[PDB]
Design a protein around this ligand. Structure first.
Ligand code: NIY
Ligand code: NIY
Ligand code: NIY
Ligand code: NIY
Ligand code: NA
Ligand code: NA
Lengths: 309, 309
């Protein structure tokens, strides 16, 4: 498995693979991702940091944008407070093993030249396109604000300004990224990670929807959250427990079961697990028990690093 | 006629008169108006500069904003070119006798603190409200751009930033001004001048609609434009020729007519003229002849100052 395939693994899309293959030849290459600071850092965050670690192992310099000004425009509070939560998020990412450079958006996003470019992009971006780009990002608002349409052109300008080769984010970012690839002279390679389903199966996992596992959740909390989670027998689509098994667990995987239910079961790949589960040969409760215990072990070093502060 | 009434004369509205009366007591008081730079300076501009001269005579320090960055956001071209047209407009205003300070918007509107405040106002302003505020300003665009909704919050921030006591503009600005009075801690007094009708009577006089008299138009050009203008007998509403008589001409006014049509006629006020014209006692052609010749004399010193450059 070469560098390209390592980077591609468990992504939803790469825009475009040919452009990524051209970047991979350079000696010096940079990848960045931005996060609105979040009170809790959850598995959706972790999936993305894992992808940044993969890029780092492929020779990329990693930059983590603590997107304080974007969060401000998206109604997350005052800059002062947002920045404090950003510093906490930095500590969590560091505890995940990421070695990276961290920058706050407002360190450069209020520069005269940055702003001037935002206004030039504003002349090229329709209101309809900007609003469409924000459908999966913008905070719920019955009376959408002008800030909502500044946000995307701010993010477009960010990759242009910083000179990054690769931008990474969840699929919720893909319309902003395709706007950037249309408007900017240098085309940035975009790597989009899948959006995890919330534990109740009803929407996407989100810090604001209370449907997440946080990386520093206690073992008991993780067991309770998974016990209650949506997980229909034979159903993989939209099944948060199967997503966790696909994106976080190490294989071959031994699923412990009582002898009266088949005894311990060893699966060599996620695809094998998927066949077992689809064939109703693996019961949700045993899948849940394995996913909970393996996820606890995966998160343990992160939780422990945060606990010793 | 005191300072308040001099300022009020020929305005459409003052928001509010009580606030203006409080400003008038101060020793130091400032009034400003902004103009997107315009290739031609027309009677609509002149009406407003006349109002700035009235404020100047009432003890106000006058600032003329050459609104280069606003014009840029409203699709009037590149900043470089817009700024050149701004310097020409300054020369025209000076030729009208205005003594004032001139500032380009971009001298301060790209400051970090200015921008930060724009983004704070963006959080408080709905997209619907911003678009409504721009209905009579925004350049025609079948696909409205994000720039269109940045523009008004930029203008709101301008009066707040510069610390002006009074903002002056045409009635087309009134929704932006009422947004500013809602969002800003210090309430700015707003003085709105009437919108002149275009010469063909079909819309408002505009530099982009080719329906204007420019202050530096030749006498022959002024005569031809007025000869062709909408001017129905007995109709005052929407009659550009009667508007010119109301807002630019000095009274008492002697209207020369052939003896076979009544001979020379002297009117002591615009209201007298209005009664004559409504009663079909003054024919459009004689009104036009008088308005053309008196307007030529009014504009003559401006045209001559510009010609001797
Ligand atoms: N849109 C990202 C945050 C973000 C990512 C990348 C960026 O460049 C910026 N930005 O520029 O402000 C912001 C999120 O949903 O969390
Ligand atoms: N359509 C989603 C977009 C969204 C998802 C998750 C979120 O955390 C936020 N948000 O609050 O910024 C917004 C919503 O209902 O809001
Ligand atoms: N809206 C004005 C121009 C303008 C007036 C006042 C202002 O403060 C600003 N501005 O801030 O950019 C711009 C026009 O239609 O010509
Ligand atoms: N509703 C008017 C608003 C407007 C009037 C005059 C103008 O010069 C401009 N303009 O081009 O900026 C715009 C229009 O049809 O455009
Ligand atoms: Na090398
Ligand atoms: Na005094």
């Amino acid at each position: 498995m070469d560098e390209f395939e390592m980077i591609k693994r468990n992504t939803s899309e790469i825009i475009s693979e040919e452009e990524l293959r051209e970047v991979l030849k350079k000696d010096e290459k940079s990848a960045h991702i931005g996060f609105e600071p979040s009170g809790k850092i959850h598995l959706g965050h972790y999936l993305q940091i894992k992808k940044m670690i993969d890029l780092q192992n492929a020779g990329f310099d990693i930059i983590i944008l603590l997107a304080d000004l974007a969060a401000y425009l998206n109604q997350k509070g005052e800059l002062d407070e947002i920045r404090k939560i950003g510093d906490y998020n930095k500590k969590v990412f560091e505890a995940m093993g990421l070695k990276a450079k961290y920058v706050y958006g407002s360190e450069f996003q209020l520069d005269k030249d940055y702003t001037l470019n935002v206004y030039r992009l504003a002349l090229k971006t329709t209101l309809k396109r900007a609003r469409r780009s924000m459908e999966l990002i913008a905070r719920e608002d019955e009376n959408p604000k002008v800030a909502e349409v500044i946000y995307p052109i701010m993010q477009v300008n960010c990759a242009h300004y910083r000179g990054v080769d690769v931008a990474v984010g969840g699929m919720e970012q893909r319309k902003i990224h395709m706007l950037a690839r249309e408007l900017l002279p240098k085309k940035v390679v975009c790597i989009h990670n899948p959006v995890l389903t919330g534990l109740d199966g009803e929407g996407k996992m989100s810090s604001s929807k209370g449907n997440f596992i946080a990386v520093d959740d206690s073992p008991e909390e993780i067991r309770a959250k998974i016990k209650k989670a949506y997980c229909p027998a034979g159903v993989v689509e939209g099944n948060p427990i199967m997503e966790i098994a696909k994106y976080f667990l190490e294989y071959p995987l031994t699923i412990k079961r009582p002898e009266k239910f088949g005894g311990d079961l060893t699966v060599n790949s996620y695809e094998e697990l998927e066949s077992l589960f689809k064939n109703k040969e693996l019961h949700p409760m045993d899948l849940k028990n394995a996913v909970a215990e393996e996820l606890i072990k995966i998160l343990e070093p992160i939780r422990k690093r945060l606990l010793e502060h």
